[PDB]
Symmetry: C3
Subunit: 449 residues, 3 copies
């Protein structure tokens, strides 16, 4: 049936020492609250209600999911008060799932089990048994059935012995929720409005509350400071690394691999230590990635070998390309089949053709380079005049002597050769040798300072 989600993110993240709202701090390259929103949508949420207290401008800039209904909670008078701010927007005939904006690892599988356990006209509750339940809501039961929740501060010493605690996540019909929310009072230890009081209220009406537990404790851990965020980051990376290994991707050290986005891949891919994958990356079959590489929003074809310490962003490599070590590909870098880029070579908005090579100490920017081309060490395409950028065109079968400067815009015809140390300011004819050289001379018995 129909279901909407409410995410409470209006608390204050004091122990973060940040000018950025807590729920906006990232985990795996994505805002913590975005992880929660993705979970809600992945579960099938019709609407996602986001309850916030401040940093609204920043939140709105960062969060732009279409089905987001922004709900203000000016004063943080408790989770109960927060839900009251969203309640008017709940549909009487839909389920309402409540989540926290700072509990990023909640899994859709567990939420789905929770939805399934929710009884008609009742409440589905997510609980966990902890060795030390200190500080959390205690689940009370009567003849095995959940009858309420007692907050740590309000709980007696004996009640504090209860180890089954409230994760905070629960689900119930919207009309029922409105009914219970209207009856909340702040006559308790904290002097706030407890969303947890709706459990006793439902039980009193004869409705049943059923509790289900998460697969892992990490799923329901909340983040209040950077150290906690750090730990969840590791858990997330570890689980992703493990899935990749089980899916056939060889990671030389799963503890030294970070994925911050999406990784699409073929068979027999090998990834060495300390590699970082960002944004959306596609890897063909047998791609080998050497240690320390950083690859972002790029496409890498079959059989490519990316040598150590290579940085790649918004690049496209055809099959059998070899780049690095110490290569740097920037947006627009394109390599055709079998192309090669060596050490200390940078490419930006440049295309290197089939079997073409740029082995060293080179800059290729705003260029189109043909097939079977050899770019000597030290070559530079001078694409910028201080105000505009210009294109360099190199036809097939060209041999560029080392330390050549190509002053764009310029075109080098097919089959040409450019002598070492040339400054190319004009088009070069096909099968011609371009040169601008001073004959070597010599001064005898030269004494250095």
């Amino acid at each position: 049936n129909a279901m909407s989600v409410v995410i409470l993110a209006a608390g204050k993240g004091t122990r973060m020492y940040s000018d950025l709202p807590k729920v906006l701090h990232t985990l795996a390259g994505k805002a913590m609250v975005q992880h929660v929103i993705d979970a809600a949508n992945e579960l099938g949420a019709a609407h996602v209600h986001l309850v916030y207290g401040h940093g609204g401008d920043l939140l709105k800039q960062a969060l732009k999911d279409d089905n987001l209904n922004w709900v203000l909670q000016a004063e943080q008078l408790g989770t109960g008060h927060a839900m009251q701010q969203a309640a008017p927007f709940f549909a009487d005939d839909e389920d309402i799932l409540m989540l926290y904006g700072d509990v990023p690892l909640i899994s859709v599988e567990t939420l789905q089990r929770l939805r399934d356990a929710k009884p008609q006209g009742g409440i589905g509750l997510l609980t966990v048994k902890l060795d030390d339940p200190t500080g959390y809501g205690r689940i009370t039961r009567e003849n095995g059935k959940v009858t309420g929740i007692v907050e740590h501060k309000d709980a007696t010493d004996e009640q504090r012995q209860i180890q089954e605690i409230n994760t905070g996540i629960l689900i119930a019909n919207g009309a029922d929720m409105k009914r219970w929310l209207a009856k909340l009072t702040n006559n308790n230890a904290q002097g706030e409005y407890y969303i947890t009081d709706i459990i006793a209220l439902a039980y009193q009406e004869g409705r049943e509350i059923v509790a289900v537990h998460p697969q892992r404790l990490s799923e329901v851990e909340g983040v209040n400071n950077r150290l906690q965020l750090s730990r969840l980051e590791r858990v997330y990376q570890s689980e992703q690394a493990e899935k990749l290994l089980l899916a056939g991707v060889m990671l030389r050290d799963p503890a030294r691999f970070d994925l911050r986005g999406t990784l699409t891949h073929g068979r027999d891919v090998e990834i060495d230590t300390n590699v970082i994958i960002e944004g959306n990356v596609t890897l063909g079959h047998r791609v080998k990635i050497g240690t320390g590489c950083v690859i972002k929003n790029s496409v890498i074809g079959d059989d490519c070998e990316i040598s150590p310490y290579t940085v790649v962003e918004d690049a496209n490599l055809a099959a059998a390309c070899t780049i690095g070590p110490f290569a740097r590909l920037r947006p627009g870098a394109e390599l055709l089949e079998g192309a090669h880029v060596g050490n200390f070579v940078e490419m930006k908005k440049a295309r290197l053709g089939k079997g073409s090579k740029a082995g060293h100490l080179t800059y290729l920017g705003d260029a189109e380079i043909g097939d079977n081309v050899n770019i000597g060490a030290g070559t530079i395409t001078c694409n910028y005049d201080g105000a505009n950028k210009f294109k360099t065109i190199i036809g097939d079968d060209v041999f560029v002597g080392s330390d050549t400067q190509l002053v764009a815009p310029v075109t080098v015809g097919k089959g040409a050769t450019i002598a070492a140390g040339t400054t190319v300011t004009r088009n070069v004819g096909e099968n011609a040798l371009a040169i601008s050289r001073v004959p070597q001379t010599q001064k005898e018995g030269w004494r250095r300072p």
Copy 2:
């Protein structure tokens, strides 16, 4: 006495998602099955029988140990059936040790203890007590003596309570083995031929089976998927790192060090984080290796300092050399005493003499450079004309101005100076200044675009 080893590697590695046979996947830069073969030979095996089912071409390409006897097992009808395929090759007077091709960490010390425990005319068995013995063969005993093995599938619930399980490794006389192997039947739960049935068969004959245990569980863990391979990789790296530390090598972080081959070393060597050692590497006394370096098949003399992010392969450094950070030495790179290579410098088949320096943005390929030489930033030896490679020779005491292009083949005489920005196409005399410079001129009030 005489002993041969049989390695069963004919099972199918389905959960690997690979086109490469499972036992060929590497651990520490070596095929898993090669680890097992090395163990067999290290223990003293006269012959090593390798039982395979497919990928024979790939296996034969990768494995080339002289004492390997390849045994085919076309249909995988069980470990018992696999041993029957090798049995005809067992000598009646030698011990036969059975190992698995996908259990890479088995230690020679444990195998040696197993050999020693084997009773005359009996069987030495390797067992381990697990908290959860699910899925493994259960060891049955009568008055403390091993009398048989019952496979998980064939075992009753009560028998499944037995926690001592079969690691799979065992040893027995060859003639005895042939005798028992001939009597195997496939009337069991799996409908296969269990090598494990020979335990009961030996006991029935009045022969004794003695069980010994491994030092660590990791020693007998098998690999069926990449995640399991990953874990064993870490265990292996951790133990190697620990031995190195105990041997006097300082690793700044043993969890961030990888050795894939052999490391020979002197005293007081310091290796920072994320260093990777491949093939055969020799390090003299007091060598210091900065973070992220990759060193392969190289020799590094006393007191060298390899700065951060330097890649080295098939290179030879004399004492007191300093290279990096961001230096890249390729095959044939040779540095004599006290030589220096700085950042963004690449060397290939090139020799840099005593106290000689190439501090920046340089390429030295196919060159012989004398002592007390200074190579300025931007210098390039143009060793390739598009079809052939040529040599560059630089005598002692030469000062090469920055951004010099040396067009090989060419020789620079001793004591020469090469002016900055020179293109050297001809030999330079001794103590002479080579130059090819356009005098600097100027155009007044130049307006850029």
Copy 3:
């Protein structure tokens, strides 16, 4: 009241395989014994007595704290004998705290608690309960009170059951210490003089011994080999990383962060994996540090972004600078606001002005570069003539064409343009174009080898 500290560092570090005295091996970039000395001074020590046996020259070179009193212990006849060598220097009216030179993580907080527990005329003792107390001094008690210490070798089997052991750290009045030290005998299992015998001696006099425990076992762990040193290094890095996270510094992976010195910082600093901070580093607000960077003795202003694999030492960056990836800043490198240094760029004793850029394959050494300057790829300041270093001056608004060689000493006037491929040997006038170019020519139908 007054207190002095005695550090016993005269034992022999055999299992280190080093030519450097054991206590001089570093942990977090500092000698193990220096960690102990810092603890002593941090606690308020008037004098720090260092008892050594050899390597005195090396120790004296490395250790130079003003309040250090060097005490020789030629023969290592036991901790008791070692203390006797320092005793003559104890003041009758000061407390004497004994520490070990190879127990680097002892915390000042625990030492302070120990000082506070010391009873008038008695002894404060630091003890710990271990699961396996093997090899350590056993604490004996009578009616709950500490009455002595029995060394493992001298202890009976029943006494070896005692799990509360001596960490070795203790404190007592100096006059009392001298009194007890004079009565030590070497009639025991080791045939040495046990400092531990003073416990029974004090108890016999009617003085009381009070025991306090450390916060963590790591605090009192001693180092005898490199593997143990390694573990303490990790503990130290982990605790420092954790404090930084709690202080508001975001570390993408606290297990892959190393701090070897001091880190001062603003708010919202983000540090990616494998970054290493050395010496004294200051980071402004919102500084972002990409993976693998090494930063030493440097200052980094607000909003700077240091891209991957950048090495920085003794550099000063104003606000909003962007450098890397693969940039290398050496001592004296200074960037003014908004400056930019790209890949494969090296700077040494050079200043780059406001909004100035050096994006690629460049060397800037001994230079002063103005604001709004563009340094093209391949540019090199030739600061060295083989004997002397010279300065390069570039005024504001200069555009330097790529692959330009500037032969220092030289000055480029404000607003000038330097053509690509120029060798600049003379001053360039303001708003003028400097050039030294051979016009491009062409040879038809050139056939390569």
